[PDB]
Structure formats: structure tokens, C-alpha cells
Amino acid sequence: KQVSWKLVTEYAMETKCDDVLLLLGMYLEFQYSFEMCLKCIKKEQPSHYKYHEKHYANAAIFADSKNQKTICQQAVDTVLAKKRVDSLQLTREQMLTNRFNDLLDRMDIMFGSTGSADIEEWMAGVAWLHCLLPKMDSVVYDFLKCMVYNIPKKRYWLFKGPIDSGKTTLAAALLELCGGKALNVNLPLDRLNFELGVAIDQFLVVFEDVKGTGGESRDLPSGQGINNLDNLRDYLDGSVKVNLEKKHLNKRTQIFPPGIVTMNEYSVPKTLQARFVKQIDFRPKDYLKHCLERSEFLLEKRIIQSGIALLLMLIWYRPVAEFAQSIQSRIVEWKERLDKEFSLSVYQKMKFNVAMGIGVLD
Amino acid sequence: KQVSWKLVTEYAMETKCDDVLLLLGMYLEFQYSFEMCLKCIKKEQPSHYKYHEKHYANAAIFADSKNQKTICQQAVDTVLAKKRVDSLQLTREQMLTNRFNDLLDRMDIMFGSTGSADIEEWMAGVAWLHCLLPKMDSVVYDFLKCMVYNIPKKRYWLFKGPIDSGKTTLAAALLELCGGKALNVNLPLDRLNFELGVAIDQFLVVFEDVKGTGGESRDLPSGQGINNLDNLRDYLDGSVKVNLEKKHLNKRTQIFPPGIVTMNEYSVPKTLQARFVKQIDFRPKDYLKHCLERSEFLLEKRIIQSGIALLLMLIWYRPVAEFAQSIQSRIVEWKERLDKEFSLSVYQKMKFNVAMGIGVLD
Amino acid sequence: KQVSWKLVTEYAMETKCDDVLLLLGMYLEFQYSFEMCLKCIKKEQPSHYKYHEKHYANAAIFADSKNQKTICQQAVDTVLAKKRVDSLQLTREQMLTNRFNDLLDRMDIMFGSTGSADIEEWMAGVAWLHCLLPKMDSVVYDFLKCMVYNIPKKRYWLFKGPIDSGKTTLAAALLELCGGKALNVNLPLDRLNFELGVAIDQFLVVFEDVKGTGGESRDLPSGQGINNLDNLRDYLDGSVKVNLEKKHLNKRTQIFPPGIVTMNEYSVPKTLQARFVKQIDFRPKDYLKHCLERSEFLLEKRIIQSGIALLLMLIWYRPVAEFAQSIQSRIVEWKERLDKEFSLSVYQKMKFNVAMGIGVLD
Amino acid sequence: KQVSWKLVTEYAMETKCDDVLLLLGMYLEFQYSFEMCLKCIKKEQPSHYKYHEKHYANAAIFADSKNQKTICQQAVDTVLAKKRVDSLQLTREQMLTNRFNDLLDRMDIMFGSTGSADIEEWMAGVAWLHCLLPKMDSVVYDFLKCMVYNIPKKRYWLFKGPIDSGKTTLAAALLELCGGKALNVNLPLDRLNFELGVAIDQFLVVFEDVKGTGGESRDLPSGQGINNLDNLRDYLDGSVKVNLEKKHLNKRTQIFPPGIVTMNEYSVPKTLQARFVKQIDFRPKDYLKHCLERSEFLLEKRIIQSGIALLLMLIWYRPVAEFAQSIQSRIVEWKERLDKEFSLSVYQKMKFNVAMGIGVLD
Amino acid sequence: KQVSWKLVTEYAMETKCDDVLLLLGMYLEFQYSFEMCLKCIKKEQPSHYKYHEKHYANAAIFADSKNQKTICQQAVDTVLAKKRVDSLQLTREQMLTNRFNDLLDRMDIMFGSTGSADIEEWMAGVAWLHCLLPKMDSVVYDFLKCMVYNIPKKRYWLFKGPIDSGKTTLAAALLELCGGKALNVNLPLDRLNFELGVAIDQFLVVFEDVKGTGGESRDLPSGQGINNLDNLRDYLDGSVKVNLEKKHLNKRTQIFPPGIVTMNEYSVPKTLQARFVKQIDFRPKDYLKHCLERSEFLLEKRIIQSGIALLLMLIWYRPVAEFAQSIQSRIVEWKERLDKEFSLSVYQKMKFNVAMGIGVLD
Amino acid sequence: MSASAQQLAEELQIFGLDCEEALIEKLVELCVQYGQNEEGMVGELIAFCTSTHKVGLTSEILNSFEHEFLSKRLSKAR
Ligand SMILES: [Zn+2]
Ligand SMILES: [Zn+2]
Ligand SMILES: [Zn+2]
Ligand SMILES: [Zn+2]
Ligand SMILES: [Zn+2]
């Protein structure tokens, strides 16, 4: 005869839904019956068939609620509250530990019985990705720890390279591999405050294509990207607690999370370059282009730019003695599954086709 | 039954949490059981195992509350209210007195049994920091009192120096040593009002890297930093009660707190320089660079830019007759602990390696 | 059991607290016990030990209130409401009458038994202040009445003088002597509306350092100060009811209060100068500089820029036949106290040291 | 028992208080006792001693109300609602009829027993005002009707004249004589919408000193005044229902009221001048200056710029056959009072001293 | 003892009042008594004496309501809701059908017993209006249908003509003849969104005097009018559902209604002219000027720019076979009234005086 | 080129140092004979009215100033 808020909040803490309308719709699907729900039998969304029977009782009354958006609203705040806390208690290495596990959770489903993901294609992506930069997997481990160590004025990395090379492909996958959001600074420093407020309680930021006055002869349009970066020195250093705003009333005043800044061969001030760590010049390789011309599954199923892809690359090359001691037991698990499905011959055979310019899976 | 607001407000006044979502999440961890709480046994956060048994009763019902964000909201206002009052009653010297004690409280935990902080490394930072500027510790005492005396048009200090020298490293530590926030003026004078409203009830402000039209030949990008500073003459003087805005409706109309303004060799108008007190030209020293190359613990554990670091430097050099008479008894306490762990030989031996360019702890 | 709003509102009308969070914190200190309150015995804040026993009963329940910010909120509106009314009923001379009395109230405490203010130092400030401009006290009386008479296009005064001379020192003290707020126009005409809305129900305004295109050869940075002043002709005249905005929804449409405009030798349009009354060119005197070099108590305890300082100067020189007939009885009171502590010899002896360049109290 | 809203609303409709905080404070003065109220016996404000006994019963409980600002809030809306209606039902001539009567109501009090206004001084102002422009009284009647007739692209008048001449003195008095508000366009076209929304349900607008690019050689600062005027063609014509905004949510979409535009000899586009009706070039007369030099009562008591002053000038010269037939009976009333106190000799004797350059009352 | 909302909403749906404060005041006039209401006997406003007895019962209690603005608020939403629906169900021709009838409703009152409108003057306006442009009535029918047909990139008409010619006179009348609102684009593209959101659920838009860079030699001030028009290509075409915002939260995403764009001989880009349909160059005729010089009733009573005027012109010339079949019966009604009062001689006799330059009614 | 007695007279109206046109112009010479600005002259002058105890100003006390204090430290005659 009354709706339960603790249950809705519970479901929220589970799916970690930090959205209002999203959390509302998802919960409004349990006000029917899991008795004949197609989505429950077909095993489509783990956030449905795994929580319907758990919240079917409350959702039944939730439908006749006059505060459907209010109940879910408080849940969202509880979700953001959790992250608000974890960003202070758990070390930057533990935060990743949880991420790496959540990334594997999806894998245990997609690469299982209720999954439609083909491990062969994702293993092929690990090949293309390793053929993108010298010792790609090696660099990934360095970036990861670089994010963990968190060294002032020694955090952001530079993905400076021409158009179409792999920047937006890697800078994106890394975002999901570690966790966080991708911002933009091409817009005036007006809405910059309304966008920089997304890095709150995050792990890392991703600045996509920053426009600068430099490169006026290379047909490179100028903007405010490079400029804005310099107008955010402390933000790049992280030695001080910058100010952030979330929905009018201030929500945080913490240390601006590190990250990656991408660009297309624009000019970079010395006072700006001194805020970076490493500069990775992406090279527009042809064999990579011809490679995807016969490997649509990488661009279609989003593999070359998936965080799950890099995870497979971290478990394939990097030893177990490098991961968290609480996850080392899970790393070995897939080191057996991957070596079982693919040996060392079938693997390099894929990187081989990459060198040729043909399908990775040929 | 019923949820208690005075208890939540009490916990808020304790941790001095001036955040809404943060105060919410932290309190939502006491709705379980301190009987087997790992965070309570492991002694991770003093704001947890020290207040769970105290608020376990209310938090238990807090979970089934329909106003979880409302209850914590009022608490936040009570927190800001406290600071709102202290900024008028307690003298500027007493405000620091409390800060210095809170800084030592963390030390009594990290340098104790439930702490993972190594006093050796922090003592090493005091060495690197003293090798940053001539009579560093001496300057710190002057700045402190300079902030206490509060002399109109004689408050802000200038940290003008080239890229990578120690500006952002000191200007940051000082911020935590005294207390306050760090602002930025590189952004248009539009959102300037939404950022300058952070210095409310604060102690000092920190302007990180101000861009000016000057230094166009030194590859120094121009901006609005220097300009904005001049567009805030009264703000720099403090002889009048400037206007401030916090979340739409005005929250304060007080005297703009003093502080520090940093820059990278930009041109400075005479009408602006006349608003400062002392100009500290930071020198990019090599031995300091090579020093950190073998002392990662300073950059990792954040020591060279920690307020706690400067505190150790103030207790090591400066006599007890300079601190507050209500804290002089605590200053002598650590003057015995530090001299017990490190003599005068082991100390200078660290500053020695600094001169060399090797690890401070060698 | 129930909280009283009339009591909180009463306390608000007493301290005239026009702040929300401030009024909240101050009232939250009476929910303990005046039985052992240190602030009540030490006699620190007249707004504490004088009202605790008066509001101890309500504050006791105020703590367990779910609307701590709401109760105090209404009180604030009642406070602003009072000023909103007085600005229309009481003549501009009566408004000052009340101010002059409130300024003396502080004196009766600081210069009493529960005060830590030394009358000797404040009398010394009256000397330095009189050595700032020819017939300083005489000018003060003229400005006061100039504000009372309120003559259209004949209200604002000009404090045009080089850097470091006494402008910001006098323009500030006068602000407290009469009452009001100090605004700024160096910022774009965008937030100008959000700042000009402070002069609501005020008495006078203080424009600190206005930047103009003039003086480009005198190393004087140009801005929008002078320009904005001209973009506010009616605002300067006061013959029409200008529009003002306070927190989104308009709060007033009255006559813009007179005031003082300060600057540093910038160029002034004839159409702008015709909106002023008198131009006081402040001279950077050396003997004044060397004077404060041996009189830190003036800059520390804020005396040379205190409204209470000018009050002592008005009671020392100006006769009783010039003050309000309802305050003439109080003016004579201090004319006996001051002449009792300091004769005419000890007074001029202070102005003497000013001429020398040594401490006023030598 | 319970607070009455109809009573508060009634008082609001009486004083026509369109303010929230103002209406609140005024009503909070009846929660004491009219038994010994000084303001009730001294007859200071007609909005007090005339309504205290009427609202003493409700105000007594109003004090213990938890919605003091809410009750008065609704009243304000009822006030604006009245004007919102009158601006559509009553003809533009009837609206003035009510104004002229309200202006006389003040006179019946100030020029009565409970008034401190001297009719001699106000009659002197009528002399100075008539010595400001050729057939001043004659022009006033034309402007009045010009506002009544309301002829598209034939409404606004031009008060173009040098600095200090009488523009701001007349353009102000006229505003009160007819009714309305005075706006400004010197500010960017950004806040223009937040200021133009004041002419809602008004009668006429007053643009004070509009800055234009013209007159660059006459030391006349340029701005956006003239430009903004042209950017408001339809606003000046009034043949279409322009859009207006009051406090976020739109409050009106009516015909922009006519008015007067003042300036200081700036250049005026032909497309702009074609939106005016008559151009009055104010001449900076000396005898007028020397006149006020011996007639401070005009500038002090605000007479030369008072709407009540022009009213006396309309009743002195203009016949009764020109006023509304419902007010003609009241016009004759003062035509007897004025002719009783002052004949034709004493009147012209004042305009005489104006010609000389001495006090109007000599 | 309860207030009815359905009744207030009913009255709202009747008068179609889409205003909040307006609907409030109008309804607050029925809380007295229609027994002696002067406005009810004099027959002044059809929205009063026709609904007082209908809502006298509820309005009586409405006065003692604590939500006077809330009750009327919901009514307004119901009003806008109606239009929100009609703009989708009723064809663009039916929408006009209702308008034409509402325009005649006013006529049946003003040209009746309870009306003060003289049919002679309005018939004279039809003469002046027909002497404004060749086959004026003919053009009106074309525009009407042009609005009905609604042809993409073939909707807006151009009223390009010199100052004072009849543009603002016709573009205004047409607005009322069909229905809708008149916007402006001279203001920055900032508040453009807050103004373009008025065309929501409307029929047509009216852009008054658009300023362009062209015509710099013809003393024509440049602006952003012409530019903004080009910055709204899709808005002019109407082949896509543009975005609109009403009071913060979006209220509509429909097809931008057609309309008319007026200007004063400014330069027009080819890419802009291609968005129009017909260009009507208004000629500043003298005989029209001298005509109004002896026909003040047209400018006073607003006839030459009234939608009711054009209606009379549509019923006088255009046959009945052109109107809606549901209104054809009403068109013939006035075709008998007009021909009864005025023959063909008295009509052309008015257009005759127009040719002369004398009063249309001579 | 002088020192403008109007600039030195101001300092004489602050401490109530009554001096006619002839007296104020007497100090103007002190600003040209040694170069002492109006601000430093008045500062050193009143220090001479204390060493000899003289709260009055004539043409003698102002004359003995160039023979007692400034006479033993002329910087334009070495
Ligand atoms: Zn299901
Ligand atoms: Zn615990
Ligand atoms: Zn106490
Ligand atoms: Zn009374
Ligand atoms: Zn009626």
C-alpha cells in the first residue's frame, strides 16, 4: 500500500545508474510481470532479468506513484554520492581495480552462453591495436600507472598526430579502460565551466582535437583549444583544488583529474608542453587502413576503440604480478581461456595480415 | 522512530563537510553495521570509524528517509554558517591557530600506529623545500604574519618565475598550510563573478598563472590574467567590502581575502605591482630536478606541495615563541619527536644530496 | 516543542543581520548554554552575550528544527524590509543620525571596560587623517551635508589622485562613516547590473579605481571604468528612478544613491565631470609614508580607514550645533571624554610627528 | 486564530504597493499598537495612520505568521494585476485622470495642516520651469494629449540639448506628471531585455542620455544609445505588440508605451528622427543658473523636477475646459486656492527675479 | 467552502486569456456584486458583464483563496494547451476561419448598440488602405492563401520600402487579420532564442525593420537584421521542425510559422531573397500623408492599422465563394449591412478625397 | 623657477602654522637654496621649533633655521 524507496535506491546502487530519466524508465519495466517477459528469457540486459524478480514487488506499486521521478531522483543522488566517496577513500589504484573487474564482468556475459560477442574478433582487435604504435601494450601499462601515481604537472599525455591515424581510436578506448569522461575546449571559455564540471569525482579527462592558432599553413583551422589549455594551468598541474560546478549550485572543489589531450599537429606553447608527460606522434599508416577494409567487425562492433579490447591486450602481454593482488586471481583465469582458444601462432597470424593490408582474420 | 537532524548536523560540524552529496554518501555508510565494517577495523578514514557508533542509530533510519538530500543539505548550511561566523569573530591569527592544529591532527594519525606515512620522506621534503628559495622557512613566517596583519594594498605576494621552478609547488602547499582556495582569472570576466565568489569567508586566494599581453617575444601566450587583476583594484587592496555571489542569491559582501598571485615572467603594470608586497623570482634549479629524479616519494605521496610539509618546516626552524600561546604546548611536542627521530646530521645530510642531484634519502 | 519565528526575527531586527547563513550560524550558538559560555563571560561579541539569555529558549528547539535555514531566511527578509522602509520615511539626515549613533555604540564598548581598543591610537589616526588633506575635517562636514541635501547632477565627488596617496583610505572610511556599499565598474557592462543592484536602499556608493582610455602615456592601464560612468548618466544625476535587480526578480526601482568615484589621474570627459561636485586631487606625501612606518597600529587595527576614526574627527573639530538635535546630547558626551584624556598639546604633538615623518605617538 | 489575506491584499490595493519587501515592512508596523504610535499622531505617512486601525487586528497575528513574505507576495500580484487590467480597459486619457487626482491628493496633505510643504516655493518653481522653455505650459498640454492620442510612429519626443540645461529636470518631472518609468539603453543589448521589460503596463518611457557615435569632435563619448534606439524601430512605432519579459517567465506582449528620449547633441539617423514627433533643443541659460544659486529650496525639496510642480503649472495657465469632465470640479478648486494665496503680481514678480538671476522668492 | 478550478479554467477557455496576472485580475472583479457593477451596466468589456453572473459564486470564495495565482496559473496552461492542440488538428485554413469570426464578433458589438465605433470611419480606412497599394484587397487574398497553402521556402513576403510609406501600417494590420505575433531580430543572436520562441503554435511572424550592412550611403544604419535572417535558413523554409524554447524548459519543436519581413531599402543577399515569395516596394505617397492630415480618426482609433479594417475590405471586394463554407453565411450578412449604410457612390467618394489630399470623410 | 608657496602653505594650514604671504615666500627660498621640497622643508622646520621651544612663527625663527640646522649641512656648497 506504499512504495519503497530503499529498493529503488538499491537497484540504483547496483546498476550504478547516475541518470534520472534513465533510472526511471529501466525501473518502470518491472511493473508488469517477469513471468513472460521476453527480455528476461532472451537474456538481453543484465540490468533487467537479474533484478526484475528482486524489484517486481515495489515496481508494481511504483507505477501508481505520484512521484515516479522523485523516487528515482533520490536514488541518482545516492549513486553520485557513492562515487563522491570512493574518489576520496579508495586509492587511485583500487579505483582501477574495480573498473578492470567490471570490464571483465561484461566479458563473462558476452563471451559466455548469453552473449553474442565473438572472442576471435576482439582478439583480432588486439592485433590491430598493437600494430598502431611501437610496444602499444607496453605504453598502456605506463599510462595506467602514470594515472595511479598522480604526479603534479606530470599527468596529461599528448596524442598529437595528423588526421586519421588512431588518436581518437586509442584516446577513446583508454577512456573506457580506466574510466571517466571526455571533454572539449573548442567552445568559448563561457560554457567551459559547464563542461569542465564533468571531471568531478572522475579519474581522467579526454580533450578531443584542440584547435590552436598554430598550423595556419597546414590547412589546420585555428580555435581556442590550445589557448584554453594554457588558461587552465593549475587544472593541468593538479597541485591545487580547482573549482567545479554541477547544476547551478557548486557540487565540488577537488583536484582536477589527469588525462589525455589530443590534437592534429598544432603549435604548442612551451609553457603548455611543460604540463605534459609524453608526446605520442600517431602515424597515418596505410596497412592499418587496408586492414580495416577487410575487417568491418572491428569498426561495426566497436572493438578497436573499446576499453574491453585493451583489457584483453593487458591480460595477453602483461604478467599477473602487475595487476592488483585482489584481481591477480581473475587475470590468470582469462590467461587460460585466451591461450585455450588461441595459441601463439593464430595470434601473430592476425598481426601478419595487418602487415599485409588484409583482414586480420584471414 | 523518526530521523534525527541534529545528529546529522552534529556529524557535519565535526568533519566540517561543506559539501552536500559528499556529506550524504559519508553518512549513508553508517546504515549497516560497525560490527564487521572493514573500514572501521582497518582504521582508514577518521571520519568513519570515529563516528559510526555515534550515528549508527540515526543512520539506520536515515536509509528509509524520503529526504536524504534534504537532511544533509541543512547540515551543509550549518557548516558554512560556522565558517561564516568564525570569519568575523576569531582574529586572523586565531583562525590560523586552529588550522595549524588540524594539520597536526592528521600527522598524529599518519605518523602514528594507524598511519602509513613515513616521517623520513616528509622530513626529506622539508630539505628540498628549503633548497627551493633562500631562507625558505624564514619567508614562510613572514607570509603567515603578512596574512595575519592584513594590511590594505599590502597583502598579495608575487610568485613570478619561469616554467618549472617551484611556484605551483609552493603556492599550493602554502594554500593548505594557511587555508583557503585557489582561483583563476584566465577565463573571461564573465564567469569571473562565479569564481571570485569562492573567496567568501576564506583566508587567502591563489591565482595560478596569470596571462598578460607582455612577454610576446618570450613565447609567452597572452590572456586576460594580468588585465583582470587590474580590473580588481579594490579586490587587491581590501579597504572596501567587495561584492560576492554564491549560487544565484548573494551570500556575502565582505573584504576580499589576501593571497598569492603567480605568473611566468609576464609584464606587470606599475598600478598592479603597487598592489603587491614582495616579488619572489623562482629560479629553475637543476639540482632540484635531479633531486626528484631519485625521490619519487615526494611527487607521489604529494610532499613537496603539501601543507603538512611546510608545517614540519615551521616546527623545525621557527622557535615556539612565535606560535600562538594556545598551541605553543603542541609545538614543543613535535620538537621532541622530530629531534628524536632525526638529529642535525641526518637532516643536513638530506639537503646535501639535494646539492648533489641525488635522492634526498641517500 | 514548537520553534518561535518571531523571536528569531526579533534577534534579526536587533543585529540588523541582512545575511542568511550568517544569521543562521549566530543563532545556532544559543542552543547550548549561557551558563558556561566563554564568549558570554569574555564579552567578545555584543551580538552574543547580550542576546543568548533572550533567545536561549527558542534556540534550544531551533536545533531540532527541519527548517533552520527557512526560519532565518524570513528574518533576513524582515531585516531588508526595515531598510526598505527607512529609505523612504526617514529623511537622509535622520538616516545618518542613526548611523552616527551606531558608530558611537561600538565606541562605548571598545573604549570601555569590555573593550580592547586604545583611544590614544584612534586619536592619532585623526591626526594623520587631518594631515592628508587641507581642512580634512572641514571637507567631511561638506560631503556629509552634500549627501543629505541630495542635489541632482550635484552629488558624486571625485577622488582623483596618483597611486598611494590616501584615496582608498578616505573613500573607504567615509563609506562606513555614512553607510552604504562600494561597487566596481571595471568589469563588463554585463555583470554591471548584478553589481549595481547593491546600491538598493543604500545611502552612497563608492567606485574604486575606474579605468579609462586616457592616460596611455602615464603607464595607466585602460578599461571600462570611465566609459561605464558615462553609460550611467541618469544614475549619476538621480532625477529619475533607475532600475535595479536583486536576485533574479526585481526588488527595487528607486533613485540611485549618490556617492564617491575614485581614479588614478585618468582622462575624464566633460559630460562626465559635469556630473560631479568637487574634485579632490590626492597628493602622495612622503611625511605621511614615513609616519605609518612608525605607526603600525593605524594600518593593523584599521584606524586610518575606519569610519569610527572620522567620527572622532567630527566630534573633535565640528561644534555640537551642526549635529542632529537628537544626538547633540551625545556629541557633548565625548567632547568631555576626549578633552579629558587628551588636551590640545598632546593632540597637536601627534600631528607634529606627522610633519617629521615619525610615529604619531612619540 | 488565523491570518487574513484579503485584508493584506486590501491594504496593498490601497497604497498600490507593487513591491514585495516594501509591502511587507509597511504592514509589519501594525503589529504593535496605534494607541501610542508616534507616526500615527505626528501624521507622517498617509499609508500608516490611515490604515493601522484598519489592519491592526490582522497585523497582530501577521507577526506570528510563518509566511510573512508569502501573504504579502500574493498582494503584490494583485496590485500588478490591477494595473495589468487598467492598461486595457481605461482609455489613455482616463489613466491620466486618475494620476492627476493622485498628484493632488499629496497636495491636499502637504499643503494642508499635516503638511510641511510651502506653496510659495512650489509656485516659484512654476516660474523657473516656465522660464526654461518658450511657452512651457503650452508644450506640456501638447505632450499630454500627444500621449493620449497615441499615434503610431508619432509618439516619442526629443529632448536634445547640451549638458546642464533642463533636460533631465523636465524629462523627470513629466515622468511623474503622467506616470511611468525611466529606462536606459547605454548598456549592451544583452540586459536591454531585462530593462525594457519595465515599460510593461506603463504609460510612457524616459530614455536618459543616449550615447551615439556622432559628436566625436564635441568631446561627446560614443556608446550604444542611438544605435539601440534604431534596433527598436517597432518599439518606437507601436503599431505591433512587442515582446516583454518580467522575471524569467514572460509577463506581457503588448504595445510598447510612448515616451521621451533625451540626449546631448549627438548625431541622429534620419530613420530614427522619423520615429519622433518634436525636437526640443534645451538652451543652457545663465539666468536660470544664477536663479537656483539663490533658490536652494527648489533643488533641495525637489520642486523644479517634481511632477506636482508641473501640475500647479497646468492648473495655473490651462483652462478647466481642457481637463477631464470628472476632474474639472477639482481643477477649479485649486484655481481658487492659488489665486487666493498669490495674485498675478506676486507671480510674475518671481519670474522677474529669474530674468535677473536672483532668488525667485525675492 | 471550497474554490472551483474548473470554473476559473472555463472562464479562461472563454476569453482565451493566455496570461497569468491578467487572468487573475479579470477574475478578481467578480468577487463583489454584479448587482450594481457599473462595468456590467455600461457594457464596457464583453469579458466582464457576460461572465460575472456565471462566475460570481466561485469568485466570491476565490478572494479568500491562498492560491489566487496558482488557480489562474493552471487555467493559463489550459489555454495554451488548447492552442497547442489546434495548431495540429485544424487545417491552416480552419484556423483562419475561427479568426475571421472572432474579428466579426468584436464588430457585432462595436457596430451595435453597446458599441462606440463608427462604421463610417472604418469604411474610410478601407479607402485609404486601398489607396496604399495597387489592388490592395487583391493582394490580401493572395497573402491569406499563401499562408494557408504553406509552401516550403515560399512563405515569407517582403515589405521593403523607405521610411513612412505604409509598411508598419499594413504589416501590423495583417498580423491581427490572420493572427500571430511580431518579432524582432535587431538584437544580438543571444536573446534571439528568447524571442523566436514566441512563434510557437502561432500562424505567422512579423519582422519589423531589419538592419543590414547594405545601404551605408543612404544614411541607413546597419545592424544584424539581414544577417540574422540568413542565420535562420531552415526557419524561413519550414521543411524541418526547428527548435523553440518557452520559459527555460523547452515547450515546442515544430515547423516555424511563415510570415512577413519588413525593411527600409537595405541590401538583401540572393540566398535570402530566395527564401521569400513576393517583394512589395512601398511608395511614400503624398496624397496619403495629406489625407491623414484631415482624418485623425484613422490614426487615433487605430483603423488604418487594424485587422478589423482589412476584414471590412475583404468582405467589401472579395466574393463569398472565397471564404470558408462555414463562414460564407456570415460574410453575406455584412455584405448587406455595408451596402445598406454605404452605396458605391459614398464609398468611391472617400477614395476620391484620398486622391485630393483631404479628409476621407468629406 | 620657484617652489610655489601655494604648495608649502598647505602644510602650514594643517598644523595651524600662521604665516602671511611674506612668511610663506620666505620658505620658498629654502626650497631653492637647498632643494628641499615643500614636504621635507615643513618637516624639518617644525623640528627647529622644538629644539628651541617656539610654538610661534616669525621672520626670525624661520631665519635662524638656515643658521642652525641647514647651515651645518649645506649640500650645495661643499
Ligand atoms: Zn523480466
Ligand atoms: Zn564502521
Ligand atoms: Zn553565551
Ligand atoms: Zn500607528
Ligand atoms: Zn459585473
PDB file of N, CA, C and O in Angstrom, chain D residues 7-8 22 51 56 58 110 115 120-121 132 143 165 190 194 226 239 243 254 257 341:
ATOM      1  N   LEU D   7      -7.310  41.078   3.798  1.00  0.00           N
ATOM      2  CA  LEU D   7      -7.022  42.355   4.440  1.00  0.00           C
ATOM      3  C   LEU D   7      -5.684  42.903   3.959  1.00  0.00           C
ATOM      4  O   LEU D   7      -5.566  44.087   3.639  1.00  0.00           O
ATOM      5  N   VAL D   8      -4.678  42.037   3.910  1.00  0.00           N
ATOM      6  CA  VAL D   8      -3.351  42.434   3.454  1.00  0.00           C
ATOM      7  C   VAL D   8      -3.444  42.863   1.995  1.00  0.00           C
ATOM      8  O   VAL D   8      -2.831  43.848   1.584  1.00  0.00           O
ATOM      9  N   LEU D  22       8.806  45.801   0.427  1.00  0.00           N
ATOM     10  CA  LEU D  22       8.286  47.087   0.876  1.00  0.00           C
ATOM     11  C   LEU D  22       6.918  46.902   1.523  1.00  0.00           C
ATOM     12  O   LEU D  22       6.668  47.396   2.622  1.00  0.00           O
ATOM     13  N   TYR D  51      -4.304  53.547   7.931  1.00  0.00           N
ATOM     14  CA  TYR D  51      -4.630  52.133   7.764  1.00  0.00           C
ATOM     15  C   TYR D  51      -4.258  51.234   8.940  1.00  0.00           C
ATOM     16  O   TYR D  51      -4.499  50.027   8.892  1.00  0.00           O
ATOM     17  N   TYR D  56      -4.978  46.589  12.121  1.00  0.00           N
ATOM     18  CA  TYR D  56      -4.331  46.280  13.392  1.00  0.00           C
ATOM     19  C   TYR D  56      -4.666  44.870  13.867  1.00  0.00           C
ATOM     20  O   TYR D  56      -3.827  44.187  14.454  1.00  0.00           O
ATOM     21  N   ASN D  58      -5.452  42.091  12.011  1.00  0.00           N
ATOM     22  CA  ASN D  58      -4.755  41.067  11.243  1.00  0.00           C
ATOM     23  C   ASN D  58      -3.241  41.133  11.426  1.00  0.00           C
ATOM     24  O   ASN D  58      -2.582  40.104  11.570  1.00  0.00           O
ATOM     25  N   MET D 110       0.218  67.877   1.942  1.00  0.00           N
ATOM     26  CA  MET D 110       1.418  68.688   2.114  1.00  0.00           C
ATOM     27  C   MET D 110       1.080  70.171   2.227  1.00  0.00           C
ATOM     28  O   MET D 110       1.742  70.912   2.953  1.00  0.00           O
ATOM     29  N   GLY D 115       0.862  68.942   6.678  1.00  0.00           N
ATOM     30  CA  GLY D 115       1.902  69.022   5.669  1.00  0.00           C
ATOM     31  C   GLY D 115       2.976  70.037   6.012  1.00  0.00           C
ATOM     32  O   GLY D 115       2.719  71.012   6.716  1.00  0.00           O
ATOM     33  N   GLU D 120       4.480  78.565  -1.484  1.00  0.00           N
ATOM     34  CA  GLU D 120       5.236  79.664  -2.075  1.00  0.00           C
ATOM     35  C   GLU D 120       6.401  79.163  -2.921  1.00  0.00           C
ATOM     36  O   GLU D 120       6.633  79.655  -4.026  1.00  0.00           O
ATOM     37  N   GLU D 121       7.131  78.183  -2.397  1.00  0.00           N
ATOM     38  CA  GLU D 121       8.277  77.622  -3.103  1.00  0.00           C
ATOM     39  C   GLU D 121       7.865  76.872  -4.365  1.00  0.00           C
ATOM     40  O   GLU D 121       8.505  77.005  -5.409  1.00  0.00           O
ATOM     41  N   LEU D 132      12.151  78.138 -18.563  1.00  0.00           N
ATOM     42  CA  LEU D 132      13.060  77.126 -19.084  1.00  0.00           C
ATOM     43  C   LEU D 132      12.904  76.985 -20.595  1.00  0.00           C
ATOM     44  O   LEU D 132      13.885  76.795 -21.315  1.00  0.00           O
ATOM     45  N   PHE D 143       2.159  67.658 -25.116  1.00  0.00           N
ATOM     46  CA  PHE D 143       2.779  66.370 -24.830  1.00  0.00           C
ATOM     47  C   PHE D 143       1.759  65.431 -24.198  1.00  0.00           C
ATOM     48  O   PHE D 143       1.652  64.266 -24.582  1.00  0.00           O
ATOM     49  N   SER D 165      21.036  72.024 -18.754  1.00  0.00           N
ATOM     50  CA  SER D 165      20.152  72.943 -19.460  1.00  0.00           C
ATOM     51  C   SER D 165      18.724  72.848 -18.931  1.00  0.00           C
ATOM     52  O   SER D 165      18.006  73.847 -18.877  1.00  0.00           O
ATOM     53  N   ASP D 190      22.192  43.225 -24.307  1.00  0.00           N
ATOM     54  CA  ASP D 190      22.061  41.962 -23.590  1.00  0.00           C
ATOM     55  C   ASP D 190      21.055  42.114 -22.455  1.00  0.00           C
ATOM     56  O   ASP D 190      20.048  41.409 -22.407  1.00  0.00           O
ATOM     57  N   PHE D 194      16.084  42.838 -20.079  1.00  0.00           N
ATOM     58  CA  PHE D 194      15.773  42.839 -18.654  1.00  0.00           C
ATOM     59  C   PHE D 194      15.421  44.234 -18.153  1.00  0.00           C
ATOM     60  O   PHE D 194      14.977  44.399 -17.019  1.00  0.00           O
ATOM     61  N   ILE D 226      22.102  55.664 -29.239  1.00  0.00           N
ATOM     62  CA  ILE D 226      21.499  55.945 -30.537  1.00  0.00           C
ATOM     63  C   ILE D 226      21.283  54.667 -31.340  1.00  0.00           C
ATOM     64  O   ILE D 226      20.245  54.494 -31.980  1.00  0.00           O
ATOM     65  N   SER D 239       2.979  50.034 -33.597  1.00  0.00           N
ATOM     66  CA  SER D 239       1.916  49.520 -34.452  1.00  0.00           C
ATOM     67  C   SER D 239       1.809  48.006 -34.307  1.00  0.00           C
ATOM     68  O   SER D 239       0.911  47.379 -34.867  1.00  0.00           O
ATOM     69  N   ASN D 243       7.419  42.186 -27.658  1.00  0.00           N
ATOM     70  CA  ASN D 243       7.553  41.182 -26.610  1.00  0.00           C
ATOM     71  C   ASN D 243       8.305  41.738 -25.406  1.00  0.00           C
ATOM     72  O   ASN D 243       9.302  42.445 -25.556  1.00  0.00           O
ATOM     73  N   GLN D 254       2.427  43.343 -25.189  1.00  0.00           N
ATOM     74  CA  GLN D 254       1.563  44.455 -25.568  1.00  0.00           C
ATOM     75  C   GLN D 254       2.265  45.468 -26.466  1.00  0.00           C
ATOM     76  O   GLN D 254       3.332  45.198 -27.017  1.00  0.00           O
ATOM     77  N   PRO D 257       4.707  51.334 -24.788  1.00  0.00           N
ATOM     78  CA  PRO D 257       4.265  52.695 -24.467  1.00  0.00           C
ATOM     79  C   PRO D 257       5.169  53.779 -25.051  1.00  0.00           C
ATOM     80  O   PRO D 257       6.372  53.574 -25.215  1.00  0.00           O
ATOM     81  N   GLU D 341      -3.870  82.804  -2.553  1.00  0.00           N
ATOM     82  CA  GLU D 341      -2.559  82.984  -1.939  1.00  0.00           C
ATOM     83  C   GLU D 341      -1.665  83.892  -2.777  1.00  0.00           C
ATOM     84  O   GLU D 341      -0.948  84.737  -2.241  1.00  0.00           O
TER      85      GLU D 341
END
